[PDB]
């Protein structure tokens, strides 16, 4: 179906590729050329994940427990070449399908943006999430010299990867880009709660009260912290905090291993060894 105000917006055109061939809707979704490509990229990737679960690490360890399902990358001994399907090659195909699905999803958003005549901030913001994924499975493995540095595709097994990569630097909290990325993540969560609270508290005021104005919003945080960023700028700030967190997270993992091999606390020895002290 479509929203009660949606029909006047369902217009032909705005496609990047395909023209009128794929320009249609399936239920609520707009498909387009990249919806078709993205769906079958996703379909093949999901089916190979299920097949990877079906064969498992081996026959005895095979499991359909969704927590324990894991499709692992190749051994580092394979370098940047292709691996046999049951020795990490399935991970390589799924990664390619994932990249195809994510880029198609981003490009489908571009076509939707063109149909609606709105800005391209949303596909641009999603590209940062894709870029972070690309750093994890493409850029860092290539810089490290092996596809085996990618994280395994498993709900809990990719947490074991994060844990062990973190302890490859003995104390990952001292990663300066990690500290900056966490600061943006925590600040974003704080800024999101503040923004959600302010909008809700103004449009849903006290019992027997009218909806507040923009003056109330500015006055409220000026009364608390002495500064109000503004109704428009809080969305810039929220976008900046969220994208900066992902950018610095991509930096933090790409410098871990490729551009730094010692323990992360040792990186701060440049500060400790300044001749000032």
């Amino acid at each position: 179906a479509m929203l009660s105000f949606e029909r006047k917006y369902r217009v032909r055109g705005g496609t990047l590729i395909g023209g009128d061939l794929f320009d249609f809707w399936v239920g609520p979704f707009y498909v387009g050329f990249f919806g078709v490509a993205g769906f079958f990229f996703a379909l093949l990737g999901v089916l190979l994940i299920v097949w990877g679960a079906t064969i498992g690490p081996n026959a005895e360890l095979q499991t359909y427990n969704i927590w324990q399902i894991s499709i692992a990358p190749p051994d580092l001994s394979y370098g940047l070449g292709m691996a046999p399907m049951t020795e990490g090659g399935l991970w390589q195909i799924i990664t390619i399908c994932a990249i195809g699905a994510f880029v198609s999803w981003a490009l489908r958003e571009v076509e939707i943006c063109r149909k609606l005549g709105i800005g391209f901030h949303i596909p641009f913001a999603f590209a940062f999430a894709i870029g972070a994924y690309l750093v994890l499975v493409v850029v860092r493995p290539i810089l490290m010299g092996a596809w085996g540095h990618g994280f395994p595709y498993g709900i809990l097994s990719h947490l074991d990867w994060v844990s062990n990569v973190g302890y490859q630097f003995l104390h990952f909290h001292y990663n300066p880009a990690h500290m900056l990325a966490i600061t943006f993540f925590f600040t974003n969560c704080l800024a999101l709660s503040m923004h959600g609270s302010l909008i809700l508290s103004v449009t849903n005021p006290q019992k027997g009260e009218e909806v507040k104005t923009s003056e109330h919003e500015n006055t409220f945080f000026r009364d608390i912290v002495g500064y109000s960023i503004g109704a428009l700028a809080i969305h810039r700030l929220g976008l900046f905090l969220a994208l900066s967190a992902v950018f610095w997270s991509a930096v933090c993992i790409v410098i871990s291993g490729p551009f730094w091999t010692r323990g992360w606390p040792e990186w701060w020895n440049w500060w400790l060894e300044l001749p000032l002290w």
Partner: peptide
């Protein structure tokens, strides 16, 4: 543009003055 469900629409007349789609 086509009668099947999910098909888009072509604005009537001058698209800028149609008040349809992005307008």
């Amino acid at each position: 543009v086509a009668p099947f469900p999910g098909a888009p629409f072509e604005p009537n007349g001058d698209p800028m003055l149609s008040g349809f789609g992005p307008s």
